[PDB]
Amino acid sequence: AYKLVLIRHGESAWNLENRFSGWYDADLSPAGHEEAKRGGQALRDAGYEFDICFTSVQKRAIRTLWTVLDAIDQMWLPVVRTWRLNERHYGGLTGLNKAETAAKHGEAQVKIWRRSYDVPPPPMEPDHPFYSNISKDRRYADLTEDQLPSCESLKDTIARALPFWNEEIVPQIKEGKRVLIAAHGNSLRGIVKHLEGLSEEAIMELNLPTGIPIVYELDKNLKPIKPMQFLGDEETVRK
Amino acid sequence: AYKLVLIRHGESAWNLENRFSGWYDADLSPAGHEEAKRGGQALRDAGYEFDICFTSVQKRAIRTLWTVLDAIDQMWLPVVRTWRLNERHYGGLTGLNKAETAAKHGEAQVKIWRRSYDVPPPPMEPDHPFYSNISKDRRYADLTEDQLPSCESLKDTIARALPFWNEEIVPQIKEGKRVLIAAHGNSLRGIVKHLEGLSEEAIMELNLPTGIPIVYELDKNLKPIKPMQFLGD
Numbered sequence: 487a488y489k490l491v492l493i494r495h496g497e498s499a500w501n502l503e504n505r506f507s508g509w510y511d512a513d514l515s516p517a518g519h520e521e522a523k524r525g526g527q528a529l530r531d532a533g534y535e536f537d538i539c540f541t542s543v544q545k546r547a548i549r550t551l552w553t554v555l556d557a558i559d560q561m562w563l564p565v566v567r568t569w570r571l572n573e574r575h576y577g578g579l580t581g582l583n584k585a586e587t588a589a590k591h592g593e594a595q596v597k598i599w600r601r602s603y604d605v606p607p608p609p610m611e612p613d614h615p616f617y618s619n620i621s622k623d624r625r626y627a628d629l630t631e632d633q634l635p636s637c638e639s640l641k642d643t644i645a646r647a648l649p650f651w652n653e654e655i656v657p658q659i660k661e662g663k664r665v666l667i668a669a670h671g672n673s674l675r676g677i678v679k680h681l682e683g684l685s686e687e688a689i690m691e692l693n694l695p696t697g698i699p700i701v702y703e704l705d706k707n708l709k710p711i712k713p714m715q716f717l718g719d720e721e722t723v724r725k
Numbered sequence: 726a727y728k729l730v731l732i733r734h735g736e737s738a739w740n741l742e743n744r745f746s747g748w749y750d751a752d753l754s755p756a757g758h759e760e761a762k763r764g765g766q767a768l769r770d771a772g773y774e775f776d777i778c779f780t781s782v783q784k785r786a787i788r789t790l791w792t793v794l795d796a797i798d799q800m801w802l803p804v805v806r807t808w809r810l811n812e813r814h815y816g817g818l819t820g821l822n823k824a825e826t827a828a829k830h831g832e833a834q835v836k837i838w839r840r841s842y843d844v845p846p847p848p849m850e851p852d853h854p855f856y857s858n859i860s861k862d863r864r865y866a867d868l869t870e871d872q873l874p875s876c877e878s879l880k881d882t883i884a885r886a887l888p889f890w891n892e893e894i895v896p897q898i899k900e901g902k903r904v905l906i907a908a909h910g911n912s913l914r915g916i917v918k919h920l921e922g923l924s925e926e927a928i929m930e931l932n933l934p935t936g937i938p939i940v941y942e943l944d945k946n947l948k949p950i951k952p953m954q955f956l957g958d
């Protein structure tokens with residue numbers, strides 16, 4: 487049974503603010519840092535060993551991975567970063583909080599975005615306060631026109647994440663190398679939905695907790711042999 | 726003019742940098758960590774941008790690089806780890822201080838080792854406390870029996886570092902990628918010795934400062950245009 491571990495970044499400084507980050511490069515909160523530290527300790531107590539690590543190009547994910555590698559004494563592992571594991575790109579909502587979003591669009595429209603699988607938020611325009619910050623960041627310079635989002639539905643996000651899963655991670659798994667993925671809830675959703683063959687509707691009430699290791703046991707066709715297990719103390723897994 | 730940056734890690738735990746730390750995977754002491762922070766701030770204040778990073782598979786170098794990348798807000802950079810930028814492998818001497826080495830091997834052999842460029846230290850005996858720790862660490866599992874050092878002269882270390890420089894780093898530089906290297910005193914000595922065409926005698930007396938960015942300006946043939954420049958105070 488192949489062992490695959492997934493983890494969502496610990497709590498971000500904007501998670502505290504209820505503020506939409508998307509492709510904005512928000513750092514971990516101190517609490518989020520401790521979440522990743524404890525997840526790491528859970529992985530160490532269980533004696534987990536990895537051979538390669540995949541992550542996004544966003545610091546909350548990357549720092550979660552670093553803290554885990556520190557905890558499990560495996561800082562020497564290969565790490566691969568890709569924009570394809572990025573958070574979903576929330577377009578115009580980027581930088582706004584719950585209240586601002588509601589005030590601008592109404593609770594009906596927010597409800598629809600919350601429930602829909604294929605309806606994108608409004609796009610991030612050039613006069614948007616974070617337009618340069620995200621769209622002109624040199625880390626995306628090698629992205630084509632079509633590849634660089636102005637906004638994403640979950641469907642979109644999943645659609646650009648899965649080719650990385652298929653071409654870069656699946657070959658590693660079949661080669662028998664134990665993979666650790668540190669990413670975001672919505673990019674991880676693509677992976678979960680593909681593994682468990684979930685529905686559009688089902689994958690949307692799937693909420694992945696921040697900073698908690700998720701273990702999959704896969705067979706030769708990479709289908710789970712059992713449901714996902716959360717890792718950590720009893721207090722933690724209790725939630 | 727290509728820009729190349731080197732940085733040697735700072736102080737390791739338990740005074741290990743004065744106890745031949747070699748391939749023992751010692752972490753930075755808090756002081757060494759702080760050195761990496763100051764180097765990071767120096768690169769940040771100067772507005773340096775990199776495109777790719779190289780380091781060893783040893784904890785102290787890797788944490789130095791993490792600290793720098795944090796400081797210059799470029800944690801998203803691609804990072805490549807290689808045993809070929811490791812510290813020199815001091816074999817049986819690893820972990821011992823001057824007195825202990827002198828006492829174990831005699832001062833004749835010690836005299837030879839301090840001055841020689843190509844005389845290797847003796848290998849790790851099975852009763853050596855780091856024997857299994859280093860020689861059976863899975864990070865070196867893909868090394869052939871001939872590749873896996875039991876002990877290295879400075880010549881050895883340089884000899885296994887230069888192929889990585891030629892095959893993996895030189896192509897990035899010719900393509901215009903701005904390279905940051907976070908490594909160890911002796912492997913960085915290999916790279917400096919290759920860049921400046923220095924002699925054995927000259928390279929053995931060159932000591933690179935710790936926790937401070939070392940800047941090279943290279944020409945289209947990757948020769949330095951000017952001497953190495955330190956960044957900082």
Ligand SMILES: CN(C)c1ccc(S(=O)(=O)Nc2cc3c(c(O)c2O)C(=O)c2ccccc2C3=O)cc1
Pocket residue numbers: 500501502503504505506507583584596599600607
């Ligand atoms: C920005 N942050 C941290 C944040 C924003 C909104 C909320 S909320 O209103 O209380 N609940 C809540 C709200 C939302 C979502 C979602 O999964 C969710 O659980 C979405 O997936 C979602 C997707 C696309 C547009 C809007 C939403 C949305 O507004 C909770 C947190």
Ligand SMILES: [Cl-]
Pocket residue numbers: 565804
């Ligand atoms: Cl890394």
